[PDB]
């Protein structure tokens, strides 16, 4: 029984060694994902031309600015609840609507700085930053 148990323990140790070896010798897909990011830049190249051929980004930025202007133009003075509309005159003496307009324009400039280019760049950065080889090495070394 002792010899059989020792044989079983040796077999389990050999299996664990083989499993660690197989884990270590599998890092091909990590390249593929990086390669995926490469093809993304190709789309970016297309992007780098598409606006210059379509001006879609210019139209969308104009649309965002126009929507923000319409939102800023909504006048609460002549709306319902006329007594609450007096609060608007309170805004006249408390620069509240000015703060609202400033926050809306800050949101506008933040969104207009968020385009497809930044999304593609950040996606490529995240794809290339994640390195599964280090994770596999840590998993195979810590576990024993």
Swiss-Prot record:
Source domain of life: Eukaryota
Location in or out of the cell: Cytoplasm; Secreted; Lipid droplet
Sugar attachment sites: 77
Modification after translation, per record: Palmitoylated; structural requirement for proper assembly of the hydrophobic core of the lipoprotein particle.
Induction of expression: Up-regulated in response to enterovirus 71 (EV71) infection (at protein level).
Subunit architecture: Interacts with PCSK9. Interacts with MTTP. Interacts with AUP1. Interacts with CIDEB.
Function description: Apolipoprotein B is a major protein constituent of chylomicrons (apo B-48), LDL (apo B-100) and VLDL (apo B-100). Apo B-100 functions as a recognition signal for the cellular binding and internalization of LDL particles by the apoB/E receptor.
Pathological condition linked to this protein in its record: Hypobetalipoproteinemia, familial, 1: A disorder of lipid metabolism characterized by less than 5th percentile age- and sex-specific levels of low density lipoproteins, and dietary fat malabsorption. Clinical presentation may vary from no symptoms to severe gastrointestinal and neurological dysfunction similar to abetalipoproteinemia. Hypercholesterolemia, familial, 2: A form of hypercholesterolemia, a disorder of lipoprotein metabolism characterized by elevated serum low-density lipoprotein (LDL) cholesterol levels, which result in excess deposition of cholesterol in tissues and leads to xanthelasma, xanthomas, accelerated atherosclerosis and increased risk of premature coronary heart disease. FHCL2 inheritance is autosomal dominant.
Identification of the protein by name: Apolipoprotein B-100
Gene that encodes it: APOB
């Amino acid at each position: 029984a002792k010899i059989n148990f020792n044989e079983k323990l040796s077999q389990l140790q050999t299996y664990m060694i083989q499993f660690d070896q197989y884990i270590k010798d599998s890092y091909d897909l990590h390249d593929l994902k990086i390669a995926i990011a490469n093809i993304i830049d190709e789309i970016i190249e297309k992007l780098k031309s598409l606006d210059e051929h379509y001006h879609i980004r210019v139209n969308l930025v104009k649309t965002i600015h126009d929507l923000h202007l319409f939102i800023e133009n909504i006048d609460f003075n002549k709306s319902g609840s006329s007594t609450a509309s007096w609060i608007q005159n309170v805004d006249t003496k408390y620069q509240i609507r000015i703060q609202i307009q400033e926050k809306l324009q800050q949101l506008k400039r933040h969104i207009q700085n968020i385009d497809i280019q930044h999304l593609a760049g950040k996606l490529k950065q995240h794809i290339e930053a994640i390195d599964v080889r280090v994770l596999l090495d840590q998993l195979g070394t810590t576990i024993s």
